[PDB]
Design a protein around this ligand. Structure first.
Ligand SMILES: [Mg+2]
Ligand SMILES: [Mg+2]
Length: 626
């Protein structure tokens, strides 16, 4: 009798580790697993919140008739999952308390940087990947050996609808780091299942929206002001002789009315001011002041990152608009717009509670016959998605191909020398590009490409730059010395690793892909492209192709799995920055080109494989006529 009845015995005899276990979905999964008879370890940062969650669950267990409830619910406070050292301590603490872990519930997540890519610090991106994605691999790598040795285990990654679907990506503007980490959580389950079977199940859950929008609305309105100011300054500079520095000085009085009426100001800035007044709330200082110090700092960074020369202290004396910069009426209005938009996307016109999602998840965990899947414990969304892995294709139109004549091409890479050689020669010999800038990682890479392209090096058509781990500064060098690019083709510097992804039942797994190697994989195959895109998305007229890693007939099955992991995970990034790029005055296109095809299965077939690559890249880097 009672709603927990459905649960008694459901997970009896299991030991579960739940990260982010002090609140939200994770706390409810921990609660319901304990009611179902599992011993649970709840991991989180704040001791107090985790203590009160422990006390609530233990009280509920005793209420249902469990005895010795202290033995059934343990906590691991101070656990920052972005710290590899603290993940090691968590596993030690959990094994000492309970012995082998049966269920790894990878639930901890941080929201991330919550900015557009062009405003997203590289270290904040990396931190989100460590907290939300690399942490899931790390705990799997520590717990799967014991699971396989005992003959059973279960890894559940708590992804999100923001991570997309198996064969379709979803844009998540202002959340690219988060969306990438969510897509990676799903892709990890999709590609590791064949290696972790038969002993270990690995699945993801991807709930849709779950039960304030005010902070989110806040961010949207501040973002809007930043984007509108940036876009107006870029537009004004196209038809005004003054330097960007001189144009930004027009903003320093921080006075909407004075700017609208300044006959020395470019019309784009006067029209912007007229817009802020006409569309604003009279009680909001954003209707009478152009910006605040927070928005001003982000604007200055965009301009610097786009190559504009301005003093670091240009906004040091900017007058500070009085609170509220946006009124609660403005914030609540945008919040209701966000809410109503999500409610409108749900087929069922209701969102689940955290309890509902956890209950469905805890029933799902009892199913012993599924692996490699993403379960949707809530779902039914009208969001548009972008199918991934469409194959058949050809050359672009002759009108678009002719537009490459005289263009400046950037190629980035090092490992894929045959791809880089053929692409450079296609642009230069076949389509009359003026010059190719070859941006490599090392001097040895540079010498290799200079050797392969010696004729074009001698003729001044092929320039090489050595980027090292300073790709942003290398792009700046290319822009200053050789001019802005049209095509930019971004291939990974590094090949995929050649290591096993699982160990033998009785082995120590010492040769299996390490936690540190997994982080390096993300650095070289995801963050590499993020860093290039972050810069190129400020370069007007660029067409960026992000290229994911190769697999050949000599590539291992582990490399094929890692290539598919990267493909899926990067498609979340590509879809997101595509939408974000619509908000800047700079005209940029961003597309992804996948080298590894769907199935694993002589010098002629190779050269046609490479020729389809060339055609793919041309189809997304040739500019459409204006
Ligand atoms: Mg100008
Ligand atoms: Mg654009």
């Amino acid at each position: 009798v009672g709603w927990a009845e459905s649960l008694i015995g459901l997970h009896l005899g299991k030991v579960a580790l739940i990260t982010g276990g002090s609140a939200g979905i994770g706390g409810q999964i921990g609660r319901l697993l304990a009611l179902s008879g599992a011993r649970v370890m709840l991991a989180a940062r704040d001791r107090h919140k985790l203590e009160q969650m422990q006390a609530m669950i233990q009280s509920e267990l005793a209420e249902v008739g469990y005895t010795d409830v202290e033995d059934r619910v343990h906590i691991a406070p101070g656990c920052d999952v972005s710290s590899e050292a603290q993940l090691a301590d968590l596993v030690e603490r959990t094994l000492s308390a309970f012995g082998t872990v049966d269920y790894l519930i990878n639930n901890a997540g941080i929201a991330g940087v919550e900015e557009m890519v062009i405003d997203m610090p590289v270290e904040g991106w990396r931190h989100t990947l460590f907290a939300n994605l690399i942490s899931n691999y790390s705990l799997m790598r520590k717990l799967a050996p014991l699971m396989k040795k005992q003959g059973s285990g279960y890894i559940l990654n708590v992804s999100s609808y923001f991570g997309g679907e198996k064969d379709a990506a979803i844009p998540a503007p202002n959340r690219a780091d988060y969306a990438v980490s969510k897509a990676g959580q799903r892709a990890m389950a999709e590609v590791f299942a064949r290696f972790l079977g038969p002993e270990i199940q690995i699945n993801a859950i991807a709930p849709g929206p779950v039960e304030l929008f005010a902070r989110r609305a806040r961010l949207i309105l501040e973002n809007k002001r930043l984007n509108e100011l940036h876009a107006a300054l870029i537009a004004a500079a196209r038809t005004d002789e003054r330097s960007m520095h001189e144009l930004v000085e027009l903003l320093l009085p921080n006075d909407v009315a004075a700017l609208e009426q300044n006959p020395a100001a470019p019309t784009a800035l006067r029209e912007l001011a007229r817009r802020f007044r006409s569309e604003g709330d009279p009680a909001a200082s954003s209707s009478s002041a152009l910006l605040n110090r927070s928005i001003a700092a982000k604007l200055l960074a965009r301009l610097h990152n786009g190559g504009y020369v301005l003093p670091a202290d240009i906004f040091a004396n900017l007058p500070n608009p009085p609170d509220p910069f946006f009124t609660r009426a403005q914030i609540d209005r945008e919040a209701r717009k966000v809410r109503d938009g999500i409610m409108g996307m749900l087929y069922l016109q209701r969102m689940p509670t955290e309890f509902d999602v956890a209950m469905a998840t805890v029933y799902y965990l009892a199913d012993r016959n599924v692996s490699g899947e993403t379960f949707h414990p809530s779902g039914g969304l009208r969001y548009e998605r972008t199918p991934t892995g469409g194959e058949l294709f050809g050359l672009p139109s002759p009108e678009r191909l002719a537009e490459l004549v005289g263009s400046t091409v950037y190629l980035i890479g090092e490992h894929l020398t045959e791809h880089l050689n053929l692409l450079a020669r296609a642009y230069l010999e076949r389509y009359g590009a003026r010059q190719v800038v070859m941006i490599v990682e090392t001097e040895t890479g540079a010498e290799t490409m200079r050797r392969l392209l010696h004729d074009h090096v001698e003729a001044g058509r092929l320039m090489t730059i050595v980027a090292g781990d300073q790709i942003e500064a290398a792009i700046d060098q290319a822009i200053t010395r050789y001019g802005r690019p049209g095509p930019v083709v971004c291939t990974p510097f590094r090949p995929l690793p050649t290591v096993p992804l699982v160990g033998r039942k009785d082995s120590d797994w010492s040769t299996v892909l390490s936690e540190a190697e997994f982080a390096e994989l993300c650095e070289h195959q995801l963050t590499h492209h993020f860093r290039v895109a972050r810069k190129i998305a400020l370069s007007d007229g660029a067409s960026l192709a992000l290229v994911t890693p190769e697999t050949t007939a000599t590539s291992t099955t582990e490399q094929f799995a890692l290539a598919n992991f990267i493909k899926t995970t990067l498609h979340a990034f590509t879809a997101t920055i595509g939408v974000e790029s619509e908000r800047t005055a700079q005209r940029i296109l961003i597309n992804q080109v996948d080298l590894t095809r769907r199935a694993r299965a002589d010098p002629h077939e190779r050269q046609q494989e490479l020729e389809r690559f060339i055609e793919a890249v041309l189809l997304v880097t040739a500019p459409l006529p204006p």
